[PDB]
């Protein structure tokens, strides 16, 4: 997270860490939505251009973490995956359109003060919160600069940007399954997600029912915090039927 601060304990109970068994390295971030399903960005798992294709057996999910590199004995839980599902129309050949993936864990995790899932938005909530100017929050154990890694989970609150402005900031085709967030160069405020944060959540707190909803997923960007650029996120509500399907087709 560039220009973001350390989080608090219990601040993002849904934040997950995807770990690689060998080498033991942080890979991506994710979120817990039920006691058995974790949600991440598909390119964290599959990206042919760079020969990336992980399978159940190559990953570990650490939940309840705060520190990045330490095994927080008695606080975090480590689970194995049972199945990974990628969106059948994930577009890695062009613009990471539909950058969403679901992971089923072996056994259900128990919640605690540090582990709790996040809500998934319904049409009304999406409609009322995905507006330009509304800030949302992103967290992760990613890079602190483009070119410098944090010891604790970082946070940053970013405004959502007007689609046309998102569009005029790049030469990549933005679809309706993506939104962008960040501050205009003119707002003299900074922050962004960066390498290591992909897959994590973008949540908003509902001022109607005091709940946190995950509106997006960290998907891509052109660098980290460049003035003029914005970060793109996957639009969870637009891919929610997908979500439902696999969950009520493969478990809960």
């Amino acid at each position: 997270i560039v220009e973001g601060s350390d989080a608090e304990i219990g601040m993002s109970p849904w934040q997950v860490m995807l770990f690689r068994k060998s080498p033991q390295e942080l890979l991506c971030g994710a979120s817990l939505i039920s006691d058995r399903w974790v949600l991440t960005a598909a390119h964290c798992l599959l990206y042919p251009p760079w020969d990336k294709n992980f399978t159940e057996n190559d990953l570990l999910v650490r939940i309840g973490k705060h520190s990045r590199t330490r095994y927080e004995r008695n606080i975090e839980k480590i689970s194995m995956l049972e199945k990974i599902y990628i969106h059948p129309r994930y577009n890695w050949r062009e613009n990471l359109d539909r950058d969403i993936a679901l992971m089923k864990l072996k056994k259900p995790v128990a919640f605690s003060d540090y582990i709790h899932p996040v809500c998934l938005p319904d049409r009304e909530t999406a409609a009322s919160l995905l507006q330009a100017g509304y800030k949302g929050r992103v967290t992760g154990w990613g890079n602190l600069k483009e070119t410098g890694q944090p010891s604790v989970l970082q946070v940053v609150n970013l405004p959502i940007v007007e689609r046309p402005v998102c569009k005029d900031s790049t030469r990549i085709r933005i679809t309706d399954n993506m939104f962008c967030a960040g501050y205009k160069p003119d707002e003299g405020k900074r922050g962004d997600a960066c390498e290591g944060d992909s897959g994590g959540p973008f949540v908003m707190k509902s001022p109607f029912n005091n709940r946190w909803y995950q509106m997006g997923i960290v998907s891509w960007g052109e660098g980290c915090d460049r003035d003029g650029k914005y970060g793109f996120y996957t639009h969870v509500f637009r891919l929610k039927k997908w979500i439902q399907k696999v969950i009520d087709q493969f478990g809960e």
């Binding site: 770990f19 033991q24 390295e25 590199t69 095994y71 194995m80």
Partner: peptide
Amino acid sequence: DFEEIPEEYLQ
């Protein structure tokens, strides 16, 4: 950089 995790989680 990371710390060793309880062998049991790799198997």
